[PDB]
């Protein structure tokens, strides 16, 4: 039912790919930075790639690396590193580390703490990395064998400067994700597929809102529901609701999918807007 | 007896159980944002809810967050919500964050950042310095202020927030009114009167109207013992007129002496 | 000679009257909070309003609560209450707790230094002591008898958010005071009482100067004095006018009220906006 | 002998005076603001005049509340204060404190803020964080500048400050002029015509020039000895010319290279 | 083999060697701002003249500076400025110091405001905090971004810093783009072509889209084989086409989905 | 070949034999204050007038005021007084102190940092100077016999107005540096003195760009012998230049004067400001 961006599953597919081959002529980048808006479905689609080709993911997320709780990022990221390429050794599979939002609390997301990502040091871990993939060692260690080289993923809203030398280098290559007319369309009308829409009325949807992220077509779609579940409200009476939804003794309440049209998802559209 | 508009009522109970409510291809909003006038109600009749349906409240003052003496009002946020993400599993209830008031500007920026990072992951809220790997549970978030910056709009655009306009209308304002002067042996046709007597008032004029009758016995008695001798005479006892004419003709000496 | 706004003094004996009756059907606040600007006698109307009912007044300033000297504020504001309800046993008369200028250097009055008042800590103890004024121990201290109840004035230029839920639970109620055209003319008019000045003139004072305080208009009199103070000075000379003045040796000098028309004051009104 | 202008004298000593007369019924302004261009003798008529009333100034200079190295404006104004009212119980004599050359802009809205707190209540005058329940003295101040901030209108308005605006007239400028030029042997209109040649300068530029005239003097006695063995020269002793003519003849030059 | 544009080799070496030469009456800028679009080949060509010339550089990133998680600019400018001046004393030869992209407002100021300093004494240059005697070696500073901002003006027109505007003409891209595709088995036609083809494209777009044909060419071959089992035929070895008429059509796609 | 301004030569002059003659009738100031923007010459000035007077000169580096190494400034600035008077009691010629860049981080050139000038400990001192330049004991000493009066030159962009009081008791006198139009015509005809160009060519440079301080027009001559270094680095070759300028092992490489006139003055001059 999700539509999967062809562009976005070939740019992560050849890139992955692309580092267990080795074709030379070309200096393959270890790191695809896929940045972008928030609500694109920027790490959606990486899931829903990584699920097409049955590649297994170690994840690192960006509010562990701003967390002193993890220690020395430099050294969870190569942990972390290791422990992906002994899968590939032991699998014998396809596996990738993945560090997600990259730049947590940064920008309109900034909160105004002590605590923020070092950029720096995650920079400067990468850029060792990079230079040597096979040659991962944890700060202190020294005597390991060479190791199986691991694509890195990195999603954030965008990328410091810090990163241009990895990318001047080739270590690097930035992926801009912003979904064009023909993308809306795939994934708008994957969100209303079984909604009996034509591809003329999701083509018209999608220009009705030309400005708007996919996360707004899918809130559209959710709104609808609440008629359906202002009257299971009503049935079960307010005093005994918060008992049938969070004791999970009976069964859990069946919806029908509703019936729309166009005209009401853009009514809907606009007063959401206004 | 307290009257809840109803229609109050359906939008927040719909709120908060579609957050408790796992329907699959559907994608809910966590926080939602009820913004209209001063004083008309946004707060007490939210309560009304909670006591209906036996909803366990956290809540936190907009003053709070406001105050530098607060120091970090994402954490409190953050602290708050995890709080109430354990009493879901506790309590086996269902639980909800509350702040209250939140129309400073360098705080505003930061609360607004940490209800949409909140918005975002319900799941992964943690502590600013800290990391846990234990996923909490989804903490619907209701939200109270006169308008909303349009620091919001991108929550409301992608559906992490949904805003919804109060203001009363007639009918809301006879039952509230009405509730209000419940104990005061007023006629439905007496009580539809005041209404239309003051059609452009908050809710919260009328509460004050029936608190005025009170002190205008007060001040009488104090005119007639003299200001000189009220200490002694105390160191008022009988019902308060409270009819239809007394109560309009106090509310027209507070239009003439507002704010 | 000076004049009390009727609607000032009944709103501050009401509130004190109503917090030593036991009136049902209605719940009394314990806190009446007077906000307006300055130079608007919002504390000299209150002072007026004591003397007229024989009021005994515990005082704390802003600048005290302020204070690291004072210790715990909420511990000095507990002590105050304590002790001003024991006056009530004793003294058998109305006794009221006072707290003034409870936002002192905040605004525009902030000089930028470390101490401020920790308004949450005042709020959370007023907000204590509301919920039961019969029950008001001492940090620590726990074995102690009912105690009388004592009405609290505060006043400020505004009171803060985190205000809100004593108002919103009838614990405490606001009073705007910004004097009217109808409170100007008994205010001003009480200044130049004895001025041989017509009831139209200091009308037409007042809507000369609409926008001003009530500071503006005694400042406006107290000016017309300077020819009687700078002849003093030539007379005694200016070799020994300190010792004449600041040596209480010989009696104060005596000063003649001057004769002054509508037409005088709104000139200097004039020159000193200008 | 210094020229203090009278007008000058007079608002002075009438707004000094009038802060330690306790006339009731009549409430006085605290602060003095004479505002003027810059080198007219705002400062150095405020000493005359103190120096003639025998009062004893404490003097805080306008880039010491300016600088940042002097870290708390606040607090320095008030330690002046409290020193001053100290004084004023000591010694039993009207003494002032005085701020100069007031016109950083996060120092100006401090000052600002600290002379509108004293003033409100000019025996309540306490450090930030002490407190103290002795009342204290009430101390004039005095505060000089090119031009007040439209912050300081509140001040103006409610009569906690009175501004007073200092421009020379003619007379004040021969008398002020004439003393300058007191012991160099020059009358009555020779001083008079040396200020109405010179009729739109400050103070500043007549006192300048009469330095000046020393100046010419050593430079061309430089000139004559020569650059190339000057040192040697010195390691120029009588009265210079002085006249009319002379001091003209300099003002003309430095109004051609001025600033 | 790569290619460096003539001009731009000369330019720099000159303002390099200028700076070494001490040529009495002849006062040098000491830094060199290059500006341009990006991805023009700023960076590229400055280390392919150093590489020319075999100056060693200091090298600063931009994100370095701008990164508050660096801290403190003005103390890794002149820590790297200093370190560069002893290279010169030791390895007695050409030495330089570079700053990259430098195109955050906080820092910009701090940067501009360093090299001002810098720029203004080139000899005596300490640590904040720091003094010492000894004159160190003057180092020539090359900067790198988009445009300077106007804080740089001063410095521009006090002969401080050279501006030198980099974009690349037809001649200029003819020959870095045929040393990008030199081992590509490209004719000098087909590389004229190719150029002209593109005729406003940065020199990045070139270098960019040789890439692609590699990513073409896996992009095939994992359509093919299926992303289904593509993990397990891996855990696209024969050369490209690689062709005139392949590029165009690979190029034509990338203007049709760049940015 | 260079031009000293008059008017600035005077000043200096005047003010340095001043403070070496005892003129009754008229308070000399112990300092000078030359302030003014950047790139005019303000040091050079002084560098030159010194020179021409035979003056040895002690100086203190605002950056040495600046920096904890020189402990105290309150302590160096008396030392350095302290020298400079001995200098001249033994040489037995004038000897002045300077104190150079006295605003060194301030405003524009802000790098923000922790370490400032400590202005007002500066300001301190010199007042303490000033007011007695006989006695100048190190902080701690006190029996020491009376000493020589040095005069002391500062310069800085702008004086704060914490050097008023001194400024006002004639302990010190500022002297604003802005080259006027014959001050530049008289400087810049000495930079291009052996070049050729008439008194009207060299006018007509000056008043082409009127708003331009004096390094403005030296750079502008300076970018002419560009042409020459590229021959040059072409005839040695890029491969072995840097051995041929740093290594001082053959003669420097000699340049000729090149011939160019007031039109490609303006030209290059326009390209710089365009
Ligand atoms: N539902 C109600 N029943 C009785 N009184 C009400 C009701 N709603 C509002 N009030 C009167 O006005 C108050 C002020 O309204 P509030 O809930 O604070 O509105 P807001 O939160 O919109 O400012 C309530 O506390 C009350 O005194
Ligand atoms: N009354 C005076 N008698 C002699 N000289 C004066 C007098 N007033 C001003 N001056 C000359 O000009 C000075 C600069 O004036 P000042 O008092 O600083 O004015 P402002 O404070 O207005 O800048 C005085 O110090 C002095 O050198
Ligand atoms: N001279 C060159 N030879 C080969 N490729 C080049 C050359 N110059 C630029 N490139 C291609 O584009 C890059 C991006 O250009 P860069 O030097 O970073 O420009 P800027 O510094 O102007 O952004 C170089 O790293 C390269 O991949
Ligand atoms: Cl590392
Ligand atoms: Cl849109
Ligand atoms: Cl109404
Ligand atoms: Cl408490
Ligand atoms: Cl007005
Ligand atoms: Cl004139
Ligand atoms: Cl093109
Ligand atoms: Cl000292
Ligand atoms: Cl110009």
């Not at 993911?57 to 972390?80: F, K, M, N």
């Not at 720096?120 to 230079?131: C, E, P, R, S, Y």
């Not at 083509?203 to 708007?212: G, I, S, W, Y």
């Not at 609440?226 to 009503?234: E, L, P, V, Y």
Request: with cysteine.
């Amino acid at each position: 039912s999700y539509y999967i961006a062809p562009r976005f599953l070939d740019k992560l597919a050849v890139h992955i790919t692309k580092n267990f081959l080795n074709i030379p002529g070309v200096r393959v980048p270890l790191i695809l930075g896929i940045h972008g808006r928030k609500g694109e479905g920027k790490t959606f689609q990486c899931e829903l790639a990584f699920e097409k080709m049955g590649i297994e993911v170690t994840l690192i997320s960006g509010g562990e690396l701003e967390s002193p709780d993890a220690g020395d990022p430099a050294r969870l990221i190569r942990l972390r590193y290791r422990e992906t390429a002994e899968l590939i050794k032991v699998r014998g599979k396809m596996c990738v580390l993945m560090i997600n939002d990259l730049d947590a609390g940064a920008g309109r997301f900034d909160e105004g703490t002590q605590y923020t990502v070092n950029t720096q040091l995650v920079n400067a871990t990468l850029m060792n990395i990079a230079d040597n993939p096979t040659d991962v060692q944890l700060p202190g260690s020294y005597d390991s064998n060479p190791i199986r080289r691991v694509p890195i993923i990195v999603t954030g809203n965008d990328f410091s400067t810090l990163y241009a030398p990895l990318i001047r280098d080739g270590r690097m290559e930035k992926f801009y994700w912003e979904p064009n007319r023909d993308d809306k369309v795939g994934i708008v009308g994957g969100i209303f597929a079984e909604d009996g829409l034509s591809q003329r009325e999701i083509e018209q949807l999608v220009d009705t809102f030309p400005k708007q992220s996919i996360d707004f077509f899918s809130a559209l779609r959710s709104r609808i529901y609440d008629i359906q579940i202002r009257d299971f409200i009503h049935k079960v009476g307010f005093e005994r609701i918060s008992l049938r939804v969070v004791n999970s003794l009976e069964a859990p309440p069946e919806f029908k999918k509703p019936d729309f049209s166009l005209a009401h998802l853009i009514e809907s559209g606009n007063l959401v807007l206004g």
